[PDB]
Design a protein around this ligand. Structure first.
Ligand code: HEM
Ligand code: HEM
Ligand SMILES: COc1cc(N)nc(CCc2cc(CCN(C)C)cc(F)c2F)c1
Ligand SMILES: COc1cc(N)nc(CCc2cc(CCN(C)C)cc(F)c2F)c1
Ligand SMILES: C[C@H](O)[C@H](O)[C@H]1CNc2nc(N)[nH]c(=O)c2N1
Ligand SMILES: C[C@H](O)[C@H](O)[C@H]1CNc2nc(N)[nH]c(=O)c2N1
Ligand SMILES: [Cl-]
Ligand SMILES: [Cl-]
Ligand SMILES: [Gd]
Ligand SMILES: [Gd]
Ligand SMILES: [Gd]
Ligand SMILES: [Zn+2]
Lengths: 401, 402
């Protein structure tokens, strides 16, 4: 079958033929849908073959010339050595494809413009740090943010793995107390205690940038203090609520995911940090207002003199909107690239139209594409979507312990 | 069995109930189609009947008792001699409540045990059907102190056509296709509007014209019935602090009464069984008034509010929508018509999930429909993983009769 997909705002119908290529199976069955869940050897040749075929199709060079050629070297490389190395442009093409294939990413209209830094020859934690440091300064670019990914060595058997122990390159500390509850970011309480365990004297702040626990193969991690002028941060203020700045809230410029695993042609890169620029709801709605994160919503509503005594005043909704307004205002005044959820979702709709004519569909995870505020005010809410796994891909992986 | 996390609290449970999922949904291990709005003989009738009777005798703490085996026997005998069977009244009441309890897209299910069931299985004509419907509306509306209710018309049976209510709800506003191709009124109802005109209705030309009912008796064309105005309780919309808002002339109706779904109980099908609750405010304020394919008022409200509508990063859409929902809540409270906001509704749904975990080992829930269309992650259901599956008794979609 080819799933019929409807856009209810316009009445248009498309068929997702690309879904028929679904490689890895997801968590749903005819009996029950698990779509809402956050976390659901010489067959290596099979996935290497298919990825190489993808490469030469994308350059109008299938069934000719070096296509058959490159098929044989990987045949020989694996027959001889048991794995294989990717050609330079393949690593590039595979990095962009895995972004293109990320079902939960609303920012994919940008997928063709990605800076791929090849770090496959890295071989120490001090080396990672300067690779990571080049990435951060390139991507930050004085606030004119540029998408980038650094690709550390591809895992091989019988020997350890490169891993960044932090979930992101920039994280804020979270400290327990004489009463349990957390000062700082609660999402990072764990890595905060691992950084304390391995040295790092704890600060006493709600926005202390954590160090970096970087791990070379078969070696215990090594702490690396991040250069303060390399971590671009934005103090948060509101255009008309003058007291908002006095709340002392801040967030960082660069969203750099450093705990996911990049998988290209059967190869596995457990260290491949990728970075883009923020959508404002990630900071304003999820990071600052989630009950298990900074959870500032009631505090902002107190300052706004809102009626927190009744849910039907919609005090939560009014304060959340103003927090998002402050995020967008602050980043724009700081000249730091950011995108609001209306602009982001409109571009994703254009991306769906592109991917329809280009590939016959697009894997999209509705629950992650629709923003966490104002869902039905964005066009993606009214768009039916089909979720499935394509390769190359970014995958979650276990914490390195 | 699927493990299910609540990310706000860190809680973990397992949905053992999903293992009992009767019919099949649209998802496969290849591909999830969870976001799709429409995702869809004697021995098999016997099998659903047997399961339902088991459910009924379980709920009354009489599993495997004498009465239980007798009822099983009575149903098989009736299916063999007539091809179908008849529900006892208490079984119908249980089946209607279970169907609501099993509805995965309903956030209002904390209320599932408080459902007034009107037995209209003796209905013989469209005229009698209209009288039943008017009494349903009257009872459920209750001068604004709304009460949940369902009216069950005769089941589908071999030899005769179905009872059908052609209208998707008992209260709908007309949608008039216009001179240029626009729509005056509710664009969701253009089709049923054209049908009513074609069946003799003299149309109005307002934006909030209540439609007549088109009621179909077995093997009869549909018959048009006008609802008496004093039966349709409506709420003029005003804003507590934006006084120009009343001059928009917006209104909405008190009673959400779904009238085009099929009730399935133990293999028997009731193609006409309208049911009604009370509104959650986002349904009116966000979906019905602000959807671009509905009344689509968001831009005009934002212009009146003097928001900057030429850049998206001012969040003019979010600000106008919030005040439209404030206006709905204020107006319904002022008129003393039951309404629940999305925060209270989702909080009570969380309690429903916990009740159902202890009672049945889980709860079928459709995350994309449970999470409200504004301020999603501000409600607790956003951070709750959910498992979507089909249990019976059930409310199902059915094709339009025309
Ligand atoms: C350039 C601007 C970008 C924007 C505005 C953007 C936006 C987003 C957002 C809002 C999410 C949802 C985050 C969540 O899980 O709550 C997301 C997820 C994701 N993005 Fe993007 N993104 C961008 C660039 C990129 C790049 C450069 C890559 C990789 C090369 C990427 C790959 C992914 C992946 C793999 C996920 C899934 C994360 C997860 O499952 O937790 N994105 N993106
Ligand atoms: C009493 C207060 C109630 C509230 C607050 C409530 C709330 C809701 C909401 C917000 C929806 C989603 C509607 C949409 O966006 O299309 C819904 C769907 C639904 N409700 Fe409830 N409801 C209530 C009563 C009832 C009753 C009494 C029944 C049946 C006896 C019921 C059965 C259903 C069903 C079957 C659906 C799914 C309809 C569909 O698939 O489109 N609800 N409910
Ligand atoms: C690399 O470029 C990007 C640009 C933007 N704006 N966002 C991302 C996703 C960032 C991201 C954030 C989170 C935590 C946040 N919620 C789960 C509460 C988990 C991820 F797994 C992830 F990936 C990436
Ligand atoms: C019976 O009691 C109820 C109480 C409340 N508040 N809401 C409902 C749902 C009413 C309902 C509405 C819609 C159309 C709107 N969408 C497309 C956004 C479809 C349904 F299938 C349905 F059922 C029922
Ligand atoms: C329980 C639920 O699946 C979970 O909260 C998901 C829902 N949608 C999301 N969407 C985004 N963008 N980010 C998230 O973390 C989540 N969380
Ligand atoms: C395409 C998408 O699934 C569709 O617009 C859904 C999303 N969630 C919804 N949720 C509710 N309550 N009602 C709806 O109509 C919808 N529409
Ligand atoms: Cl983040
Ligand atoms: Cl409605
Ligand atoms: Gd004050
Ligand atoms: Gd005023
Ligand atoms: Gd006007
Ligand atoms: Zn699914």
């Amino acid at each position: 079958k080819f799933p019929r997909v409807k856009n209810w705002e316009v009445g248009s119908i498309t068929y997702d033929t690309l879904s028929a290529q679904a490689q890895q199976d997801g968590p749903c069955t005819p009996r029950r849908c698990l779509g809402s869940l956050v976390f659901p050897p010489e067959q290596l040749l099979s996935q290497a073959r298919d990825f190489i075929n993808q490469y030469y199709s994308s350059i109008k060079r299938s069934g000719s010339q070096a296509h058959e050629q490159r098929l044989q070297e990987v045949e020989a490389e694996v027959a001889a050595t048991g794995t294989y190395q990717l050609r330079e442009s393949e690593l590039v093409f595979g990095a962009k494809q895995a972004w293109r294939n990320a079902p939960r990413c609303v920012g994919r209209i940008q997928w063709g413009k990605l800076q791929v830094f090849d770090a496959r020859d890295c071989r120490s934690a001090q080396e990672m740090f300067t690779y990571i440091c080049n990435h951060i300064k390139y991507a930050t670019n004085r606030g004119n943010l540029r998408s980038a990914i650094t690709v550390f060595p591809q895992r091989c058997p019988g020997r350890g793995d490169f891993r960044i122990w932090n979930s992101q390159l920039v994280r804020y500390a979270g400290y327990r107390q004489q009463d349990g509850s957390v000062r700082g970011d609660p999402a990072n309480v764990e890595i905060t205690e691992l950084c304390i365990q391995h040295g790092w004297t704890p600060g006493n702040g709600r926005f202390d940038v954590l160090p970096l626990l970087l791990q070379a193969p078969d070696e215990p991690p090594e702490l690396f203090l991040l250069p303060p002028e390399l971590v671009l941060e934005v103090p948060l203020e509101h255009p008309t609520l003058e007291w908002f700045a006095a709340l002392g809230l801040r967030w960082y410029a660069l969203p750099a995911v450093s705990n996911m695993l990049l998988e290209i042609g059967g190869l596995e890169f457990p260290a491949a940090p990728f970075s883009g620029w923020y959508m404002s709801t990630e900071i304003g709605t999820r990071n600052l207002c989630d009950p298990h994160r900074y959870n500032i919503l009631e505090d902002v509503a107190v300052c706004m003199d809102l009626d927190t005594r009744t849910t039907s005043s919609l005090w939560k909704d009014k304060a959340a909107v103003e927090i998002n307004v402050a995020v967008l205002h602050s980043y724009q005044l700081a000249k730091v690239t950011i995108v609001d959820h209306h602009a982001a979702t409109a571009s994703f709709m254009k991306h769906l139209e592109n991917e329809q004519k280009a590939r016959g569909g697009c894997p999209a995870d509705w629950a992650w594409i629709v923003p966490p505020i104002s869902g039905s005010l964005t066009p993606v809410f009214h768009q039916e979507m089909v979720n499935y796994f394509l390769s190359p891909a970014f995958r979650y992986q276990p914490d390195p312990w």
